[PDB]
Ligand binder design. Sequence first.
Ligand code: HEM
Ligand code: HEM
Ligand SMILES: Cc1cc(CCNCc2ccc3c(C)cc(N)nc3c2)ccc1C#N
Ligand SMILES: Cc1cc(CCNCc2ccc3c(C)cc(N)nc3c2)ccc1C#N
Ligand SMILES: C[C@H](O)[C@H](O)[C@H]1CNc2nc(N)[nH]c(=O)c2N1
Ligand SMILES: C[C@H](O)[C@H](O)[C@H]1CNc2nc(N)[nH]c(=O)c2N1
Ligand SMILES: [Zn+2]
Lengths: 412, 411
Amino acid sequence: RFLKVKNWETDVVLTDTLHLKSTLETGCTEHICMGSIMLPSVRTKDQLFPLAKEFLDQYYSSIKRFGSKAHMDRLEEVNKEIESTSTYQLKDTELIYGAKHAWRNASRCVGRIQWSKLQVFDARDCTTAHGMFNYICNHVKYATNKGNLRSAITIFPQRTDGKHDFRVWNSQLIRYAGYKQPDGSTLGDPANVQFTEICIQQGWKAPRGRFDVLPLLLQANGNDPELFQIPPELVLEVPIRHPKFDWFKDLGLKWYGLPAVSNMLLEIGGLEFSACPFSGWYMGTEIGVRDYCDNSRYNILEEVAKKMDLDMRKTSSLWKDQALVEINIAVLYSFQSDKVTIVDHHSATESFIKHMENEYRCRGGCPADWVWIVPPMSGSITPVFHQEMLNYRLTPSFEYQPDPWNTHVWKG
Amino acid sequence: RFLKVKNWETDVVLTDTLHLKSTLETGCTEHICMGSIMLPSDVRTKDQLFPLAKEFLDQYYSSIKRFGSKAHMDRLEEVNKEIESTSTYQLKDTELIYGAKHAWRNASRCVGRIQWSKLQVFDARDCTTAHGMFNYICNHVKYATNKGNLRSAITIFPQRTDGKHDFRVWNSQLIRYAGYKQPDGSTLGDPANVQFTEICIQQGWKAPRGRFDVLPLLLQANGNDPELFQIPPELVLEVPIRHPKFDWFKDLGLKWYGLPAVSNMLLEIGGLEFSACPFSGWYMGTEIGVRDYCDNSRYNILEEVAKKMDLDMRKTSSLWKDQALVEINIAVLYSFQSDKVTIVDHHSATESFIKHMENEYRCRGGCPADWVWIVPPMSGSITPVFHQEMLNYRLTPSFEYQPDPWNTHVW
Ligand code: HEM
Ligand code: HEM
Ligand SMILES: Cc1cc(CCNCc2ccc3c(C)cc(N)nc3c2)ccc1C#N
Ligand SMILES: Cc1cc(CCNCc2ccc3c(C)cc(N)nc3c2)ccc1C#N
Ligand SMILES: C[C@H](O)[C@H](O)[C@H]1CNc2nc(N)[nH]c(=O)c2N1
Ligand SMILES: C[C@H](O)[C@H](O)[C@H]1CNc2nc(N)[nH]c(=O)c2N1
Ligand SMILES: [Zn+2]
C-alpha cells in the first residue's frame, strides 16, 4: 500500500510507505474525520512482549545490527525479565534512541528538523521530590545555556503498578500564575488559574503579580507532591519591547525564554514514563499570537490596538489583525536583541518542509498534523499551508495523560 | 458514537448525532487521517439508484412533516416505477430546490452556510444548447450580482443521463481573469488559469492583452463540443482596489470581480447527477486579498506591496510579509465596502459560522465541518473557529468534484 501527498504551491509529490508501520489509532474512521479534535483517545505483560520486541527490532535495525547475536540476546534478556518481573529496563542507548524517536514521531511538532540533537538526561535513579527538583534545575540551566538554548529531556522512573507514578504537576516547568479576582477579572495567565490555586493550597506564598513564575509541584514514587521554587537566577526572561513603538515597553510585558513541557507521557517499547519534561525553544507565534492574544489568555489585542489608535468599532478595519502582527514583531525583536534563541513562523515552517521531504526520502514518510503544523496567523503565506500531510501514530511517542490532581490518591 | 465537540475558547460543548446518517466515505481510516488532502477520490445502475432515491425522498418528506404519509408512499411508488421504467427519474421542482439548498447545507468546507436556506434556485433542466446555457448563465449573473447587493443563486442544467450527453461549464468559475504564457517565461494573468486561458485561444478566443481580462465562457451542451461566449461586460461587476490610507495603492492597478461563482462542481441529489450547476454567493475578503493576491502561485503581489511600504525585507523576522498581507486585506474590504458591493470580513463570517453551528446542533443534531477549510488563511487563532472542534463527514445531497472536461471529452 503506497500513499501520495502533494504540495499545491510547488507540485512536489511524495510517497508514504512509513504509515504501514503504524500501530496506534487516529480517532478517524472512513465515515468520520476527527482531525480537529484536541485530544482523542496498568499494563499486563500479555501486551508487553510484543511492544518490547517491536521497539527492539526498531532499535537494532537503526544501528545496523538486526538479527545479530546482540539483537537476539537482548530479546531473550528482556523476555526473561518480563517473565520474571512483569516489566523490564531499558539500556541507556535504547532510552536515548526512544526519546529522540518519540520527538521524531511527534506529528504535531513543526520543530522536528532538530530531533537528532536532543540532550537526554537519565533520571531513572531518582527517588524523591527533592531529587526531582535537583534534576529539573540542572535541566533548566543546561537547556537555557545563557540564552543560547539547547534541546533537552529529563526522564524519571517508569510506571510500575501505576500506584507509584512520578509526575510533574506543572504543565510546563516555567509558567506564570493566574489569579481569579472576586470581580471576575484575572490577574496573570488565565490558563493557569486552577494550578495556581492548587499551589496556593499546597502552601505557596503567592506574590499575586501579573508575571509570577509558578513553583514546581513534584510527585515522586506515588507520594503526595511537594513545592519547590526554581531559583530566580535560573529563570531567563525577556522584557517585551517594540522596535518602532516606544509605548510598547510600558505595557509591562515579558515572557520566559524556555518552553519546557512537563505533563506528557513518554512511551517506549511498552514502558510508560509519566514524568519526562522536555524543552526546546520558542516559535514567536506561540507567545505573540496564542499566549498574548488568545481571548482566554493575556488577551492584549485591544490595549495594543488602543495605543495604536486603530479604528476599533469596525471589525473589517482588521484592527485585530494589525495589532497581532505588531505584537509578534515585538516578541521576535525582544528575543533577538537579548540574544535568546527564537525562530519566526516563516523560518520554522520552511525548515519543516525541508525536514519532511528529507524524512520521506530516508524514512519513507513523516507523520504530520496539518491542523497543528500550520501557524496561528499568516497561514497561507507559509509553505506548510499548501502541503498535504498524512497523520498517523508511530511509537515511541509522547502521549497526553490526565491531570494528576484528578487521579491522585492522597496520603495526607 | 454519540460524539462531542468542544470549543476551547468558550468551553461550549455540542453533542453530534447527525454524523450517524453519513453515507459516503472520508478518505480517513483507523490508521491514517487524510484530513488535509485536497482531493480524496459513469452513471448509476437502476437499484443503485432506487435506494439512493428512497433515502432522499424519506428525508424530503420527513422535512415537510409528512413522513409515512400516503403522499410520501405514493411518491416512493411513483419514483420506483419511473426508475424501473426509464433507467432514471426526474425530480419535482420542490425536491430539486430542497436538494440544492441541502447540498449547500452539507458542504463541510463552506464557512458561509448560515445563509443556506436563502438560495435562489434556477431550474435550467429544459436547456438543450450551449447558446441556451449562455442565456441562463447571463440571467444568473445579472440576478446574483443585483448591482452590488449580491444574492445567492444556483442554476441547474439537465442531469447526466449516462455520460453520453453531459452538460458542462468548462470554466472553474463563471468569472475569472485570463492567465497567459509570456516572454521572459514569466506569467501574465492569473497563473492558475494558464492552461484554460489558451484552451480558450486553442478554440478561437482572441485575448485583450491584459492581465485582468475576464475570460470567455466555454460551454458544453448535451455532450457536444464546447462553444465560446463573452459575458456582456456590463454584467461583470468589478471593484477597483484602493487603500483607505496609502494612496500609492491605486498605482498597482489592482481590481477584482464581485461575483464568486463556482461552475465546475457536480451536484448529486437522490442519486441523480448534475454536472453543470454553477452556484454563487459573495466573497469573504481573504479569498481575494490573501489567496488570490498573495499566493506564490497566483498574483503574488506581496513583494511589490512591501517595497512601497518601505518595509525591512532583508529577512523574514521583520514579518514584512505579514504586515503587508494585513494592509492588502484592509484595502479589499475597503474598496468593496465603498463601492457598496457585498463582502464579509473573515471575523464576521467565522462568528456567523459559530452561530450557524449552534443552530445546526440544536435543530438538526450536528453540522459537518472541515476545520482545514473553515479556518481563514490569515489570523487563524484570533477567529472563533480556530478554537472550535469540528467533525467532518459526508452527507447527501452534496457538491462533489469531477474530472476536468478537456481530459474526458471525446473531442
Ligand atoms: C527545538 C525547537 C522546537 C520548536 C520550535 C517546537 C515547536 C512546536 C510547536 C509550535 C508546537 C505546537 C504546540 C502549540 O502550539 O502549543 C509543538 C508541539 C509539540 N512538540 Fe515541538 N518544538 C521544539 C522542540 C521539541 C522537543 C525537544 C520535543 C520533545 C522532546 C518536542 C515535542 C513536541 C510534542 C510532543 C508536541 C505536541 C504537543 C501536544 O500535542 O500537546 N518539540 N512543537
Ligand atoms: C453566501 C456567501 C458565501 C460565502 C461567504 C462562502 C464562503 C466560502 C469559502 C471561504 C470557502 C472556502 C473555499 C476556498 O477558500 O476556495 C467556500 C467553499 C465552498 N462553498 Fe461557500 N460561500 C458562500 C456561498 C456558497 C453557496 C451559495 C454555495 C452553494 C450553493 C456554496 C458552496 C460551497 C462549497 C461546495 C465549497 C467547497 C468548495 C470545494 O470543496 O472546493 N457556498 N465557501
Ligand atoms: C490540551 C492542550 C494541549 C496544549 C499543548 C501546548 N503545548 C504544546 C507544546 C509542546 C512542546 C513544545 C516544545 C518542546 C517547544 C515549543 N516551542 N513549543 C511546544 C509546545 C495546549 C493547550 C491545551 C489545552 N487546553
Ligand atoms: C481542487 C481545487 C478546489 C478549489 C476550491 C476553490 N473553490 C472553492 C469555493 C467554492 C464556492 C465558493 C462560493 C460559492 C463563494 C465563495 N465566496 N467562495 C467559494 C469558494 C481550489 C483549487 C483547487 C485546485 N487545484
Ligand atoms: C479545535 C482545535 O483542534 C484546536 O483549537 C487546535 C487547533 N490547532 C492548534 N495548533 C497548535 N499549534 N496549537 C493549538 O493549541 C491548536 N489548537
Ligand atoms: C494541502 C491543503 O489541504 C490545502 O493547502 C488547502 C488547505 N486549506 C484550504 N482552505 C481553503 N479555504 N481553501 C483552500 O484552497 C485550502 N487549501
Ligand atoms: Zn481524519
